[PDB]
Design an enzyme around this catalytic site. Structure first.
Site, PDB file in Angstrom:
ATOM      1  N   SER A 139       0.839  -1.183   0.000  1.00  0.00           N
ATOM      2  CA  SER A 139       0.000   0.000   0.000  1.00  0.00           C
ATOM      3  C   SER A 139       0.880   1.240   0.000  1.00  0.00           C
ATOM      4  O   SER A 139       2.064   1.158   0.334  1.00  0.00           O
ATOM      5  CB  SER A 139      -0.879  -0.013   1.250  1.00  0.00           C
ATOM      6  OG  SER A 139      -0.126   0.173   2.425  1.00  0.00           O
ATOM      7  N   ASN A 338      20.750  -9.742   5.425  1.00  0.00           N
ATOM      8  CA  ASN A 338      21.068  -8.369   5.761  1.00  0.00           C
ATOM      9  C   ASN A 338      21.942  -7.761   4.671  1.00  0.00           C
ATOM     10  O   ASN A 338      22.047  -8.302   3.572  1.00  0.00           O
ATOM     11  CB  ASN A 338      21.829  -8.353   7.095  1.00  0.00           C
ATOM     12  CG  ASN A 338      23.235  -8.969   6.979  1.00  0.00           C
ATOM     13  OD1 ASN A 338      23.414 -10.109   6.503  1.00  0.00           O
ATOM     14  ND2 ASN A 338      24.234  -8.205   7.388  1.00  0.00           N
ATOM     15  N   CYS A 340      25.096  -7.554   4.409  1.00  0.00           N
ATOM     16  CA  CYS A 340      26.356  -8.234   4.071  1.00  0.00           C
ATOM     17  C   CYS A 340      26.216  -9.716   3.979  1.00  0.00           C
ATOM     18  O   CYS A 340      27.211 -10.441   3.979  1.00  0.00           O
ATOM     19  CB  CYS A 340      27.430  -7.898   5.081  1.00  0.00           C
ATOM     20  SG  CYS A 340      27.891  -6.178   4.952  1.00  0.00           S
ATOM     21  N   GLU A 342      25.202 -12.081   5.971  1.00  0.00           N
ATOM     22  CA  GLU A 342      25.695 -12.946   7.010  1.00  0.00           C
ATOM     23  C   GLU A 342      24.627 -13.237   8.081  1.00  0.00           C
ATOM     24  O   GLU A 342      24.583 -14.348   8.627  1.00  0.00           O
ATOM     25  CB  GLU A 342      27.033 -12.429   7.572  1.00  0.00           C
ATOM     26  CG  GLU A 342      26.970 -11.380   8.699  1.00  0.00           C
ATOM     27  CD  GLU A 342      26.804  -9.940   8.231  1.00  0.00           C
ATOM     28  OE1 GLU A 342      27.210  -9.042   8.964  1.00  0.00           O
ATOM     29  OE2 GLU A 342      26.258  -9.678   7.153  1.00  0.00           O
ATOM     30  N   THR A 520      34.225  -7.959   8.391  1.00  0.00           N
ATOM     31  CA  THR A 520      35.269  -7.260   9.180  1.00  0.00           C
ATOM     32  C   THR A 520      35.965  -6.174   8.387  1.00  0.00           C
ATOM     33  O   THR A 520      37.162  -5.985   8.549  1.00  0.00           O
ATOM     34  CB  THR A 520      36.395  -8.233   9.661  1.00  0.00           C
ATOM     35  OG1 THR A 520      36.810  -9.069   8.570  1.00  0.00           O
ATOM     36  CG2 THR A 520      35.917  -9.213  10.728  1.00  0.00           C
TER      37      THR A 520
HETATM   38  N1  LIG Z   1      -1.275   7.080  -7.039  1.00  0.00           N
HETATM   39  C1  LIG Z   1      -0.449   6.004  -7.076  1.00  0.00           C
HETATM   40  N2  LIG Z   1       0.721   6.090  -7.725  1.00  0.00           N
HETATM   41  C2  LIG Z   1       1.591   5.062  -7.782  1.00  0.00           C
HETATM   42  N3  LIG Z   1       1.387   3.852  -7.231  1.00  0.00           N
HETATM   43  C3  LIG Z   1       0.239   3.610  -6.548  1.00  0.00           C
HETATM   44  C4  LIG Z   1      -0.772   4.693  -6.425  1.00  0.00           C
HETATM   45  N4  LIG Z   1      -1.804   4.166  -5.722  1.00  0.00           N
HETATM   46  C5  LIG Z   1      -1.473   2.879  -5.423  1.00  0.00           C
HETATM   47  N5  LIG Z   1      -0.255   2.549  -5.909  1.00  0.00           N
HETATM   48  C6  LIG Z   1       0.424   1.243  -5.774  1.00  0.00           C
HETATM   49  O1  LIG Z   1      -0.566   0.272  -5.592  1.00  0.00           O
HETATM   50  C7  LIG Z   1      -0.294  -0.599  -4.506  1.00  0.00           C
HETATM   51  C8  LIG Z   1      -1.447  -0.551  -3.522  1.00  0.00           C
HETATM   52  O2  LIG Z   1      -1.490   0.729  -2.949  1.00  0.00           O
HETATM   53  P1  LIG Z   1      -2.727   1.087  -2.000  1.00  0.00           P
HETATM   54  O3  LIG Z   1      -2.542   2.540  -1.636  1.00  0.00           O
HETATM   55  O4  LIG Z   1      -2.951  -0.003  -0.963  1.00  0.00           O
HETATM   56  O5  LIG Z   1      -3.924   0.903  -3.041  1.00  0.00           O
HETATM   57  P2  LIG Z   1      -5.466   1.041  -2.585  1.00  0.00           P
HETATM   58  O6  LIG Z   1      -5.867   2.372  -3.173  1.00  0.00           O
HETATM   59  O7  LIG Z   1      -5.608   0.767  -1.107  1.00  0.00           O
HETATM   60  N6  LIG Z   1      -6.191  -0.090  -3.506  1.00  0.00           N
HETATM   61  P3  LIG Z   1      -5.824  -1.660  -3.457  1.00  0.00           P
HETATM   62  O8  LIG Z   1      -4.699  -1.691  -2.442  1.00  0.00           O
HETATM   63  O9  LIG Z   1      -5.451  -1.938  -4.903  1.00  0.00           O
HETATM   64  O10 LIG Z   1      -7.081  -2.366  -2.969  1.00  0.00           O
HETATM   65  C9  LIG Z   1       1.033  -0.202  -3.932  1.00  0.00           C
HETATM   66  O11 LIG Z   1       2.050  -1.097  -4.440  1.00  0.00           O
HETATM   67  C10 LIG Z   1       1.171   1.198  -4.473  1.00  0.00           C
HETATM   68  O12 LIG Z   1       2.528   1.431  -4.791  1.00  0.00           O
HETATM   69  N1  LIG Z   2      30.484  -0.233   5.103  1.00  0.00           N
HETATM   70  C1  LIG Z   2      29.649  -0.916   5.922  1.00  0.00           C
HETATM   71  C2  LIG Z   2      30.087  -2.115   6.461  1.00  0.00           C
HETATM   72  C3  LIG Z   2      29.232  -2.812   7.305  1.00  0.00           C
HETATM   73  N2  LIG Z   2      27.999  -2.362   7.616  1.00  0.00           N
HETATM   74  C4  LIG Z   2      27.122  -3.155   8.519  1.00  0.00           C
HETATM   75  O1  LIG Z   2      27.872  -3.929   9.476  1.00  0.00           O
HETATM   76  C5  LIG Z   2      27.793  -5.340   9.197  1.00  0.00           C
HETATM   77  C6  LIG Z   2      29.150  -5.963   8.879  1.00  0.00           C
HETATM   78  O2  LIG Z   2      30.189  -5.003   9.067  1.00  0.00           O
HETATM   79  P1  LIG Z   2      31.739  -5.332   8.807  1.00  0.00           P
HETATM   80  O3  LIG Z   2      31.915  -6.827   8.718  1.00  0.00           O
HETATM   81  O4  LIG Z   2      32.260  -4.458   7.657  1.00  0.00           O
HETATM   82  O5  LIG Z   2      32.336  -4.950  10.267  1.00  0.00           O
HETATM   83  P2  LIG Z   2      32.796  -3.496  10.826  1.00  0.00           P
HETATM   84  O6  LIG Z   2      32.894  -2.489   9.695  1.00  0.00           O
HETATM   85  O7  LIG Z   2      31.746  -3.269  11.901  1.00  0.00           O
HETATM   86  O8  LIG Z   2      34.180  -3.779  11.317  1.00  0.00           O
HETATM   87  C7  LIG Z   2      26.867  -5.518   8.011  1.00  0.00           C
HETATM   88  O9  LIG Z   2      25.867  -6.478   8.353  1.00  0.00           O
HETATM   89  C8  LIG Z   2      26.273  -4.151   7.734  1.00  0.00           C
HETATM   90  O10 LIG Z   2      24.913  -4.113   8.167  1.00  0.00           O
HETATM   91  C9  LIG Z   2      27.571  -1.130   7.052  1.00  0.00           C
HETATM   92  O11 LIG Z   2      26.432  -0.658   7.314  1.00  0.00           O
HETATM   93  N3  LIG Z   2      28.407  -0.453   6.222  1.00  0.00           N
HETATM   94 MG   LIG Z   3      -4.371  -1.148  -0.285  1.00  0.00          MG
END
Ligand SMILES: Nc1ncnc2c1ncn2[C@@H]1O[C@H](COP(=O)(O)OP(=O)(O)NP(=O)(O)O)[C@@H](O)[C@H]1O
Ligand SMILES: Nc1ccn([C@@H]2O[C@H](COP(=O)(O)OP(=O)(O)O)[C@@H](O)[C@H]2O)c(=O)n1
Ligand SMILES: [Mg+2]
Ligand SMILES: Nc1ncnc2c1ncn2[C@@H]1O[C@H](COP(=O)(O)OP(=O)(O)NP(=O)(O)O)[C@@H](O)[C@H]1O
Ligand SMILES: Nc1ccn([C@@H]2O[C@H](COP(=O)(O)OP(=O)(O)O)[C@@H](O)[C@H]2O)c(=O)n1
Ligand SMILES: [Mg+2]
Lengths: 651, 651
Positions: A139, A338, A340, A342, A520
């Site tokens: 949404s 995540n 990296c 890990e 690291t």
């Molecule tokens: N005006 C908009 N422009 C771009 N993307 C939109 C727009 N409205 C909805 N979306 C996309 O549509 C999806 C559902 O959005 P949402 O706001 O929940 O729609 P809704 O109006 O509640 N209708 P629906 O969810 O289809 O029952 C999301 O992935 C939005 O990115």
């Molecule tokens: N340049 C980086 C490196 C790590 N990280 C975060 O830290 C975690 C691993 O870091 P790393 O192994 O490079 O360790 P440090 O840089 O903490 O020594 C990853 O899971 C990333 O979420 C980051 O945000 N930006």
């Molecule tokens: Mg919706």
């Protein structure tokens, strides 16, 4: 160029005022300040400033560059001050624990990840390194809450893995207008922009969300190309990393050379909230039902390979392997890794997964403690330290300041922990072991068995004092199923696993997970060892320092002259095919581009059975080719790796 | 090419299903469907399909282009169906009201603004045209909530005015890091990106937030340049419109040729939450205190002028004029106008101002109802219609679906309304009046006096049935102070103002505000009249149609041949200095670039005393120059205009 006494340094830091504004801006927490004040003699005389000379030139300037706290731009903290600050931030009133940690860290046994170093003992103690975020809903409301949460998180140290498998794809229907969705790319552009706007603290490290998508998503082709350097612009997102959350079926269809079908999550609900057979059943059935767009599996796969060849991304993480073998599986289906690759932890709209990280310095447990002059590895001291590092990370969970409510919910429930390692290449070189030796293969297994066994044991003691984590009941760990079991393997058996399993079933553990060896990137540089668990990238690295273990040997054989120094610049770190160097040295100082990627996968495969979570497996291909990479993906997949691939490093 | 019977058309629209998805997608509301069903004979036989031939070619194709509801891409609605749908959406069970509105609209007396036409009678009846949003807080949390709200609003029809005077500027201090703010531009880039991502319905009209800033903001220089087409890229935001919220002091300092001082809102709190003298006191005092950065007022002013000369923006709206003369002043200090510089309504983190818009067709009240063949203006029928349009807009407030909770809070409290006009140039031409004639000046005043007087009267009746709006007590209106009073002026006196003031003090009014003449960009095109209250831009406009009133005359004097047609293409709509055309015609068909901008300002100035809110005053300079524009800004300022300038239109 610095005040010597530590309480005197804590006094300045704490009393600090921003002259430009008249605002009192203390950089030590109240808590920590008071502890320092109430134990100033003990703490001041415990510090040994000689240990500042444990840091290489290029290692210290990392500390000074952006780690040691500054006062008005001048460096205020000595390296020993940063440690003693950290030790206190983690331990609080536990001066005994604090004092122990100080010593082991000062002496370079282990270190905590950069956020912990930045922020421990400071008023905004955001010590966590990674965050795994769930897209709240398909949404506009859901997209912008998630956007808001990423911003709030990006405000403090630590990277975001964010999964988006539930966002409807290009051209999907929207109730309420004759408008049609634009899918992932425009949305991804929103996230990218937010990542450029929110500094991480106040910073020099630009964007950094990794985006996790399953390859059946209808928008996948563009998604994987997000880091390309030509196509268009508004179709790119150059500060994010695409990661594939790949189910086995996708790899089966590639292998079989068959069809693959792309759904919008709304024409095909539930694909990401199941795995293994159940997923395959559900996917096969939607596919029969006409609900999606079928194409040739190998057409996607060929594209994924271009992307990796050119940009080193998307990363590859196997969804099933991760989910089948997680002690968090009782929590529900895990949707991403995540930043990296890990961390493998469960997340949901209301629970954003966190991890705290520390790494053990593997070289510090080498001794020639035999008699003559032959080294051994003190697996006892290593097990001991790993127990200490476990205890630390666990405290951090409680003294941590969470950037958002969904992160505090998550951690207080499951208490995942992440230990890793560095200097494994150094350890091999010091023990005179080629990375591909049967010995190094044996040492790998052994080291990892001992860290895991310790961390699990130390955690078990913790559960005994403070109770198991809230969600331990019903976990695989509660059923006597530890990591290697889930790989259908006996442990190597250097430690007594029966007794441990015995206690764990009886008492619980404090942490849902404990091991996730990480890159690291900066902390290896601080302690001056080679990154995590990878071979050396060169022997020269680069303002051009030569491998100390190599250099040492080169003088001992007295074959080191200018002919040597230039050949190293010339062949950029390779000593192979070089006229006057013993085979022993050659086998020992193989660069990473000279080790078979098959051995790498294996040693990953091997250590992987002692890893709760996953690890940041970079692949290195010298002369890359479609099929050469193809076999490397499939080999790892078949090994049952979780992180099949982090970066594809090339050239 | 369309089903004739209306209930039959409502049946299709209501029963509609999206074949591509199997989803039932009804386009009439339950409410309206039922009304149509329960009164099908009355409603079907009330429609007169001849009135479909009231629409020019180029007017109808606007209706068909994007107004008349489609079924599977084919047009389902006849123009009469759209009206009858609208009339019902506004009036509900009030078939009598509904029937009246139908007639007046079908017969082209007035029309509602495009959202009302799009959405009335449909399940998501978002009928409002403009939204005035307050930036919630100078925080990451505040920025992204506001971002979220803009997105949610952008989802449905209607533009956003958003003010940002409280966001700290480049380089300002942030507690919790040694990081320093990047100010408005990077933040503005976030908003710009969100505006590109959220379609308006599902659409062809790209961005559209207007951003309101006071010229003392430290980031002003860049802010005003947001629409430039060279500089950098990441310093621009090309889908937003910068608008200046200018205090008198700024203009004084420019005039005086003195100093002007730029503050971050955090070094200088409260500047935007006051005005007039109090502001001047507070600003002067901060300025004495060293809190900001002083420069030469005329250095800013010279820059603002470049921006306008090149991009036609930033718009100019006088903050004090707006606040001094608003019936909403009891609510607190007004911080912005809207997207088109016509709404002047109060907003706050928790109250986002809304307006509903309709325009009266000024030509429809011309009659040669005397006897012979001399036209007059039926100020009686005009007053009558204006009363009807007031009633309509007021109902819309209650049957409206609000895109966000802060918009429903706002409207239900103050119930502002916005009436305007179109075809004023047509009205002048039909009544044989040069735009700069003493007559046209008199007619302007008269027309506007009557719409205001009616709308206020009709509102007074409404307050009598349903109570005054919640915040009428303490308003200037409650104290017998109506708009012109606040301009220290007697009304022209065509209507009996004493009696009205008399009733208003006794009974209240239903709306806080009623008049805000708007651009009528598309609705003027529908009814085929010239935009709002501006002179013609050419006599040829452009697939090349000639002014009908001109053309008519050109044949009557039989001077129309090919020599005429080409001269019009050649001189692009100007008939001045053209050999064989009577002075009478020349004075009558002066293009806008041929009327003195001084007269324009005056007639604006004049009608302005009957305008609750403001109006979309575009300025047109033929041969633009620094000083020529300078005098036009200051002349309007001195007249006490609110919207000194909307777009600067040039070439
Ligand atoms: N005006 C908009 N422009 C771009 N993307 C939109 C727009 N409205 C909805 N979306 C996309 O549509 C999806 C559902 O959005 P949402 O706001 O929940 O729609 P809704 O109006 O509640 N209708 P629906 O969810 O289809 O029952 C999301 O992935 C939005 O990115
Ligand atoms: N340049 C980086 C490196 C790590 N990280 C975060 O830290 C975690 C691993 O870091 P790393 O192994 O490079 O360790 P440090 O840089 O903490 O020594 C990853 O899971 C990333 O979420 C980051 O945000 N930006
Ligand atoms: Mg919706
Ligand atoms: N990491 C960041 N990157 C970019 N801008 C930031 C960051 N953190 C704060 N800001 C800006 O600083 C202002 C205040 O943000 P906010 O999140 O309230 O700061 P805070 O951490 O609460 N400290 P403060 O508000 O200074 O007491 C807003 O204008 C933000 O745009
Ligand atoms: N292109 C446009 C025109 C108007 N609008 C909004 O509608 C109001 C005035 O519209 P308008 O005078 O062009 O009238 P219509 O286009 O409704 O006929 C403004 O206050 C805007 O908020 C918009 O969002 N986009
Ligand atoms: Mg704040």
């Amino acid at each position: 160029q610095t005040t010597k006494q530590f309480s005197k340094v804590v006094e300045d830091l704490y009393r600090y005022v921003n002259a430009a504004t008249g605002k009192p801006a203390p950089m030590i927490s109240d808590d920590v300040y008071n502890i320092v004040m109430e134990n100033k003699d003990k703490l001041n005389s415990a510090i040994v400033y000689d240990r500042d000379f444990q840091y290489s030139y290029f290692g210290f300037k990392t500390l000074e560059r952006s780690y040691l706290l500054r006062i008005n731009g001048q460096v205020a903290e000595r390296p020993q001050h940063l440690i003693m600050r950290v030790a206190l931030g983690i331990h609080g009133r536990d001066i005994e624990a604090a004092l122990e940690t100080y010593n082991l860290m000062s002496l370079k046994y282990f270190t905590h990840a950069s956020p912990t170093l930045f922020n421990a003992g400071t008023p905004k103690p955001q010590m966590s390194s990674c965050f795994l975020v769930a897209m709240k809903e398909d949404s506009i409301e859901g997209i912008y809450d998630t956007l808001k949460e990423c911003a709030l998180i990006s405000k403090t140290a630590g990277g975001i893995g964010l999964h988006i498998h539930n966002i409807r794809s290009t051209g999907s229907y929207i109730a309420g207008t004759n408008g049609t969705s634009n899918g992932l790319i425009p949305m991804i552009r929103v996230f990218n922009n937010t990542a450029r706007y929110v500094d991480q603290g106040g910073n020099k490290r630009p964007g950094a969300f990794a985006l996790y998508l399953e390859p059946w998503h209808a928008d996948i082709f563009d998604f994987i190309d997000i880091r390309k350097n030509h196509g268009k612009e508004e179709i790119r997102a150059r500060d994010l990393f695409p990661a594939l959350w790949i189910p086995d079926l996708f790899m089966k269809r590639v292998e079989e050379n068959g069809t693959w079908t792309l759904f919008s999550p709304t024409s095909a609900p539930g694909l990401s909230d199941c795995y293994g057979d159940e997923f395959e059943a559900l996917y096969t059935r939607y596919e029969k039902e006409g609900r999606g767009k079928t194409i040739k599996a190998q057409k996607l796969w060929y594209s994924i390979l271009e992307a990796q060849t050119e940009t080193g991304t998307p990363f590859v993480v196997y969804k099933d392997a991760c989910n089948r073998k997680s002690n968090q599986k009782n929590l529900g289906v895990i949707k991403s890794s995540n930043l990296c690759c890990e961390i493998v932890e469960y997340s949901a709209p209301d629970e954003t997964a966190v991890c705290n990280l520390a790494s053990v310095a593997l070289p510090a447990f080498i001794e020639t403690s035999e008699d003559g002059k032959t080294s051994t590895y003190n697996f006892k001291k290593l097990h001991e330290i790993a127990k200490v590092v476990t205890r630390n990370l666990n405290r951090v969970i409680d003294r941590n300041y969470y950037p958002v409510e969904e992160a505090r919910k998550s951690n207080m429930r499951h208490r995942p922990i992440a230990l890793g390692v560095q200097g494994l290449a150094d350890t091999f070189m010091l023990l005179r072991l080629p990375f591909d030796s049967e010995e190094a293969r044996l040492l790998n297994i052994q080291i990892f068995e001992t860290i895991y066994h310790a961390s699990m044991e130390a955690s078990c003691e913790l559960a005994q004092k403070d109770g198991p984590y809230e969600t331990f009941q019903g976990s695989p760990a509660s059923q006597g199923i530890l990591q290697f079991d889930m790989w259908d393997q006996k442990p190597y058996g250097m430690w007594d696993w029966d007794t441990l399993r015995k206690d764990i079933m009886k008492h619980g553990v404090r942490n849902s997970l404990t091991m996730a060896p990480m890159p690291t990137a900066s902390t290896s540089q601080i302690l001056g060892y080679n990154e995590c668990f990878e071979p050396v990238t060169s022997n020269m690295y680069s303002f051009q320092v030569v491998n100390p273990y190599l250099l040492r040997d080169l003088v001992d054989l007295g074959i080191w002259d200018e002919g040597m120094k230039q050949y190293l610049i010339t062949q950029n770190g390779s000593i192979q095919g070089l006229p006057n160097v013993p085979q022993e040295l050659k086998d020992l100082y193989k660069t990473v581009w000279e080790i078979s990627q098959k051995t790498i996968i294996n040693m990953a495969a091997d250590r992987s059975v002692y890893i709760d979570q996953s690890h940041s497996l970079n692949l290195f291909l010298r002369a890359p080719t479609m099929g050469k990479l193809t076999s490397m993906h499939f080999y790892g997949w078949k090994k049952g790796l979780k992180t099949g691939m982090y970066y594809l490093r090339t050239q």
